[PDB]
Design a protein around this ligand. Structure first.
Ligand SMILES: OC[C@H]1O[C@H](OC[C@H]2O[C@H](O[C@]3(CO)O[C@H](CO)[C@@H](O)[C@@H]3O)[C@H](O)[C@@H](O)[C@@H]2O)[C@H](O)[C@@H](O)[C@H]1O
Ligand SMILES: OC[C@H]1O[C@H](OC[C@H]2O[C@H](O[C@]3(CO)O[C@H](CO)[C@@H](O)[C@@H]3O)[C@H](O)[C@@H](O)[C@@H]2O)[C@H](O)[C@@H](O)[C@H]1O
Ligand SMILES: OC[C@H]1O[C@H](OC[C@H]2O[C@H](O[C@]3(CO)O[C@H](CO)[C@@H](O)[C@@H]3O)[C@H](O)[C@@H](O)[C@@H]2O)[C@H](O)[C@@H](O)[C@H]1O
Ligand SMILES: OC[C@H]1O[C@H](OC[C@H]2O[C@H](O[C@]3(CO)O[C@H](CO)[C@@H](O)[C@@H]3O)[C@H](O)[C@@H](O)[C@@H]2O)[C@H](O)[C@@H](O)[C@H]1O
Ligand SMILES: *[C@H]1O[C@H](CO)[C@@H](O)[C@H](O[C@@H]2O[C@H](CO)[C@@H](O)[C@H](O)[C@H]2NC(C)=O)[C@H]1NC(C)=O
Ligand SMILES: *[C@H]1O[C@H](CO)[C@@H](O)[C@H](O[C@@H]2O[C@H](CO)[C@@H](O)[C@H](O)[C@H]2NC(C)=O)[C@H]1NC(C)=O
Ligand SMILES: *[C@@H]1O[C@H](CO)[C@@H](O)[C@H](O)[C@H]1NC(C)=O
Ligand SMILES: *[C@@H]1O[C@H](CO)[C@@H](O)[C@H](O)[C@H]1NC(C)=O
Ligand SMILES: *[C@@H]1O[C@H](CO)[C@@H](O)[C@H](O)[C@H]1NC(C)=O
Lengths: 452, 452, 452, 452
């Protein structure tokens, strides 16, 4: 633990990014309509405050060296978009790269940090995603990468405007070590894709290679989670490990895969950023994004990422030869404990654990191991497929259905003991007893344990 | 994507180099005769414009510190060779090393970049191959290697002469990351040899070791292709991965090995540089170099290297214990798709793929997966062994037989739909159907798919 | 061998640290009571001189930039604690980090080395544990880490006060190479835990990965010993490999595990620092800490760490799939030899060795291989469970029971031949004969061999 | 190839070092007696010119900062020893470390390069072995190690005295790349030991790990040879890979192991430095050192290290689980070829090769593959055990028995075709025929092939 370097990111950020679906194809209308839609679906009031505009937004640089927004896509300027967003209680996020160009080939900020930082402040920006493309060889050791990213960190501070600073260097040069003191969140891997396990030649580093020299992209959900496992210890209040935007609602993942993906991202205190097209979001995906129970885990005050307790490879492998089972446990602020039984195998299986395994750093005969604990299924009481369809199809309102965090912070709700945030009690676990369930293929059992 | 740093290399370079056969043994006559021969065989007009003179060309340095060409080998100077080449519509390329000496022990350019750059400009040079021998410990991190190669990059720019800058550092210190902003192409491995699979003690890094600390040489064709697989994502217009000169016509590769080698080099957008002795070139090798269909893939406008979709090891291993099968797919500018089924096994085998595998980043129900595609064998209509022999034996002319890119750029030919550039339609692939062929040992099936 | 850079640490340091049990929860009273208790139990006079106060002791920094001790925990200041300790013949140790903050988030010493060094001298400090948290990207190569730690090394020297300088960078950037010239001891791994073999996701580097890029913590006893194995050759008089505080009396290790852990730590010349709560220490653990025989090995004059002679994996694996057997041998100053037969297997087993294996660098027919050697069980004559309980329960005094090193240095005792420091002779080993024993699961046979 | 940076080391150096047997225990008498003995046994006139004094020779530094020789060991100074050596036609070599201290703890030369260099010149030194102990963190990248060793390289040059500069950094930071331009030879691994295959915990890097981060020591003969295999390509006239002093006559290697060890060291163009006590040298070891045939390979003009053609692991493993077979081939200056069939297996076995395998870089139908070659056993006509005993026991003189290179350089002898230097013709190898022999366990078949 250390204080937030800039007072922001006391919990992981939440919001939305246009990349995963719209890529370069962007506009003022797309952004604002989507913003409205996110607000209308009640996701904004769940915490999804950040509207993040990605790459391909500028047209070039003007006479003063300052950045110029592509007026075809943005005919009123950027600050105009910020204002619309602020008026609807959103926060506004923009994109750049710590290099000559951005990953799509547009002007980059390397050596031009102050001008660009000021441009973002001038256009009333709250959040900067800062990439790693075309960095002119300014990487390869922790020090050199640290200074390149400190440049913009300092540049933003100089503008006097509070800006949530999001590093996007894919974990290059061991970012988990040096991120906290200059940033609020750092990407720790190459880009995620809508694949749960699939290895990819574009993502050469496997799950064990947290110190990757070619981060790449099209990395699977399990590849990134596996890379993040040891990094939890270097995350905390004010500085988080970023496992990339959520793929829930994107591509062709199963409901089980989407739950597992969303739960784990929340349990390791990763930024929860919607990658889906909210105007073309399916019901099952929508109810996953809106699971207040799980969001509460991610938004835990004085957040601590969960720890992977064990991992075994299984003979039940998928079409890609992948198959492993995992257990994760983690402390919660109010004395509770998160537990995940993760079945990455190709077949439905029984999974089990004990109190000894759950409270991994507790000695024999200690309170936690000698007490009885109530088990809450965090996935219970999820918005059903019919209700979600109705809300998405504008027939119903989200009001009264989805938990409102604007009305009542997650911390408050936990203090008040909202069944809304704790899921449903399905039983209890006692010393010398075993917790057992059936966990679907590529699925999860996700519990919150409370003392009896 | 980013713009070409110097406006050159909008497609991968094509041409010829004396090293693979003649090594140090060089002369004005060898160069000029070969140039004429390349022109006469019609290869020049296919795109093979660059005549690259390699090592062992200088005799020392003169009183002014400037380089001096070995007058026994070059009695008229270098600019005299340039002129002959320009007159015959060739472009002229020379060699140096970012070190104290060249790999053969001749004067090197380290710390003497401006003088040497100017010398090349003064002798009207269009292309520089810039090696990595005797670099005085100026390597080991990306930064230090970047600055060493930037030195000459800057030095060439200062001369005001357009020069195609070809890096030859064998991928040391992760060149794929930093090459684009200062160069047009970069060697990404140690030297190739006329072996398809053979591991070599002089090339200690295997196919998976793209981050190699001892690049070495005598690396097999499959060793280099395997190293290049993840690097595709860091190549594009103006900056290419260089998998070293072609070994087609050199050594004792089979026809199938030569086709596979040539196709893959083209599909990953590698420089296509003839390493063969064109005055002693055999028929089968000649027809491979002259396959307009395959060159069109390499010379695709807005070029994107193909992606390796899958790779499996097989029990059919050769004399060296090597045996793997690969599938590669890649987007083409006009909406087409390149597909390669690569049999690196020791035995002829059936190979298969689907549309789902071919369009690897396409969601279910999307156009590409729901449409029907016509399959074109890119190796059809190749110059036969009799015709090629006749052309090489001067009995026939290449004119009217080989596609003339000078007369009609590859892009135009693709727009005009020249059967010359598309191969022969052998069928079509529909959703839920499987594409199946028989692929020879160490051979390839190489397709272009067009929408129906 | 090289002289001690500062004249201290001629043998490995011994003492106690509050972290392993009390963590942040500390006070003047806790420290002083514990000090008294350590003295009363006779451990002080065995060599456990250093009372090391860990993290969470400061409240902030004062107006002059100097450090300020948290007056709630320390209402008389630090020098007041030093004095009480000096008066009772203890030495006083404090904590800081070569970073912006300490690992618990309190003021760190990076860039503020002189002020902080002076503060420690002013408060009459004898020992500094200097951590690696929040180091602002000042790591990644040996050189950069070396200078960061040299900064404080120099800063302490400037104060003119003798200070035992203990590095705590977890072996990052190959500390064993550069530690000796600027420090007395260096942590060579991430934090130990009360687990003998258990792999942990928070400690990603296994036993073979001595060059670890994410040191982590919760590393098992065998994980750290395995990492230390090759490092012996870079330790000696004045500069030692530090395998972290002893876990004897902490958590739930078996008696056999505690003996193995304690013996090995001693045999490799690691600092012997009590991590146990001495006010809640159990009998068996107490008798282990008080084994004069084993301490004599650690405190050997002109100390040389032992060498691991062999290591095999066995099918007798524990609940964590871990199971290996090891033999270690090491020269002693008086011509004797330490031998350890280490059974990390899950089952009791016979273990054997010869003189050829014991004297691993001795040629055939040399004196050591041709002589006969007496075998001394170093674990014989250990304080029994009844006597220790009595001493801990204040019924008996340690005086007359525990060896007094203050009264008679270990070297003297070895010269005088105290059966107290040599254990019990259990037999002899002759050329061509085999030394065989039964070694318990997770246990050790620990011998001193003397010439007949 | 590149010229020798200083004109020395046109062939690998030959001589003797006191370390392998006498370690720190040294004197003027030991050195001079040994020198006389080496001369009397006729080894000096075989090329063993360099008498290298190792560590533990100085007593401290004098008032001027200059080095002071330990007058108990050297009561006449060092130049006095040089003179005795020059008078007997020897060359004199001394030791230092690019660090604060030497490996035994005596004054080191880091930051004091000029004074020390001048001290060596003043005492008429011809050769410097320059170690890597206590280097104050000045390693970790190629550049930093390069400059540290360039310091002394420059310092020696400044003295104007020709000095053979021998690097001893154990291959740290890829020395094979940067050694040539500043040195004559570089250690490429940790210290050798009298073990043929034995893995050792003090030498953690295996045979494949040429890029070692903890070089260590007590590395086996096969461990070092395996590390050196890829490095041949970076050695040549003026700059050689050093595989450490010869262990022939030291410890308890078999005659077959000693032959294999000596042959391979010669074939890869390593320095041939006697590590044995020449006053206690056994017959079989003596005849190995004196095999003119094999020395001629090492001392080949325009020397090129041999290439390992293939390597397979065998089921015939020794007590340490080690067992591999190797074939090495290499070009010789006069057009001949060295061939080694190396049996690292535990059992005697038949080994075979063809001309295609021997001439690994020759195409089918080329002269070398189509010609017939005469096979010469390089180990034939070796001094027998009786004659060697007599010479060592002073009964006979070496004169007329051992080849005299002082009288006739190896190059001359090869030109004159001395059966003395070629071994005995045992047959011939023709195209499509197989060369087969029986090779002993841990033994070698070592051939020179000549065209018929
Ligand atoms: O472009 C915005 C992108 O930046 C970050 O990217 C990492 C990724 O960038 C490139 O990927 C893409 C494919 O999505 O490839 C082309 C450029 O050739 C671009 O259209 C696009 O960015 C590189 O090709 C990859 O090497 C690199 O891994 C960021 O992580 C993304 O979220 C996104 O914001
Ligand atoms: O010399 C021209 C050569 O430079 C580059 O070199 C890498 C390669 O150089 C040396 O190998 C040599 C140089 O003459 O190449 C032949 C092999 O056919 C050998 O006779 C000789 O050793 C170094 O010795 C090697 O370590 C190194 O791998 C460039 O990459 C080549 O394309 C070529 O232009
Ligand atoms: O001492 C001369 C030695 O220097 C080089 O060795 C590296 C090696 O040195 C140390 O080994 C020895 C044992 O031989 O250990 C003691 C004290 O530690 C010394 O007397 C002696 O040098 C280190 O312990 C090792 O870690 C280190 O690797 C050189 O390589 C040798 O050839 C020789 O010249
Ligand atoms: O706080 C003093 C501590 O510093 C060293 O620890 C390394 C260890 O620090 C961090 O862990 C901490 C502190 O131990 O433990 C909890 C749980 O994470 C946090 O409050 C705090 O950050 C890092 O998280 C770990 O990655 C790192 O390994 C030292 O080694 C200890 O002996 C102790 O003095
Ligand atoms: C994944 O593939 C499924 C087929 O199993 C397909 O249904 C999804 O595409 C969506 O189909 C919907 C038809 O009910 C359509 O209304 C929706 O717009 C479409 N989504 C997109 C992005 O084209 C596929 N899912 C996704 C997210 O692509
Ligand atoms: C290795 O062990 C052999 C027995 O296998 C032994 O003979 C060697 O010792 C040497 O023996 C010589 C007579 O054969 C004797 O003259 C010599 O003094 C002796 N060397 C030493 C150091 O004692 C052993 N060889 C070595 C080199 O130690
Ligand atoms: C600027 O930096 C200081 C810390 O030096 C911090 O307290 C402050 O909040 C930062 N301000 C902004 C606007 O980022
Ligand atoms: C003393 O107690 C320990 C338990 O901590 C036990 O394991 C050990 O065997 C006892 N000692 C003896 C000699 O039995
Ligand atoms: C010479 O003696 C050695 C003993 O070490 C033995 O290996 C070898 O076989 C002997 N030579 C002959 C020719 O018998």
């Amino acid at each position: 633990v250390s204080p937030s370097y800039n007072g922001l990111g006391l919990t992981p950020q939440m919001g939305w990014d246009n990349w995963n679906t719209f890529a370069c194809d962007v506009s003022e209308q797309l952004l604002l309509d989507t913003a409205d839609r996110i607000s209308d679906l009640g996701l904004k009031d769940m915490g999804y405050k950040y509207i993040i505009l990605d790459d391909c937004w500028s047209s070039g640089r003007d006479s003063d060296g300052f950045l110029v927004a592509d007026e075809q896509k943005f005919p009123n300027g950027m600050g105009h978009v910020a204002d619309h967003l602020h008026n609807n209680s959103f926060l506004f996020g923009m994109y750049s790269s710590a290099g000559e160009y951005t990953c799509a080939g547009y002007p980059g900020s390397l050596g031009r940090e102050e001008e660009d930082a000021q441009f973002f402040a001038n256009n009333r920006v709250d959040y900067l995603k800062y990439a790693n493309c075309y960095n002119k060889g300014q990487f390869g050791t922790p020090e050199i990468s640290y200074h390149r990213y400190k440049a913009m960190s300092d540049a933003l501070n100089k503008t006097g405007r509070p800006v949530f600073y999001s590093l996007c260097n894919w974990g290059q040069d061991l970012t988990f070590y040096w991120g906290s003191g200059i940033a609020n969140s750092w990407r720790m891997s190459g880009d995620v894709t809508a694949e749960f396990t699939r290895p990819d030649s574009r993502c050469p580093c496997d799950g064990d290679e947290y110190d990757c020299k070619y981060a790449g992209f099209h990395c699977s959900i399990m590849n990134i989670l596996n890379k993040a496992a040891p990094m939890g210890q270097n995350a905390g209040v004010g500085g988080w490990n970023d496992l990339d935007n959520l793929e829930v609602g994107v591509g062709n993942l199963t409901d089980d895969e989407e739950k597992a993906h969303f739960s784990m991202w929340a349990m390791v205190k990763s930024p929860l950023i919607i990658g889906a097209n909210v105007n073309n979001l399916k019901a099952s995906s929508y109810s996953i994004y809106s699971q207040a129970s799980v969001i509460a885990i991610n938004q835990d005050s004085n957040g601590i990422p969960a720890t992977r307790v064990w991992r075994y490879y299984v003979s039940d492998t998928d079409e890609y030869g992948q198959g492993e089972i995992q257990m994760w446990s983690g402390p919660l602020d109010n004395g509770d404990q998160v537990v995940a039984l993760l079945n990455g195998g190709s077949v439905s299986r029984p999974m089990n654990t004990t109190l000894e395994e759950i409270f991994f750093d507790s000695n024999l005969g200690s309170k936690k191991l000698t007490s009885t604990w109530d088990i809450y299924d965090l996935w219970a009481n999820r918005v059903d497929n019919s209700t979600a369809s109705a809300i998405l199809g504008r027939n119903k309102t989200a009001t009264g259905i989805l938990y409102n965090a604007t009305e009542q912070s997650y911390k408050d709700g936990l203090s008040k003991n909202d069944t809304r945030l704790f899921g449903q009690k399905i039983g209890s676990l006692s010393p010398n007893a075993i917790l057992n369930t059936t966990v679907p293929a590529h699925g999860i059992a996700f519990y919150r344990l409370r003392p009896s």
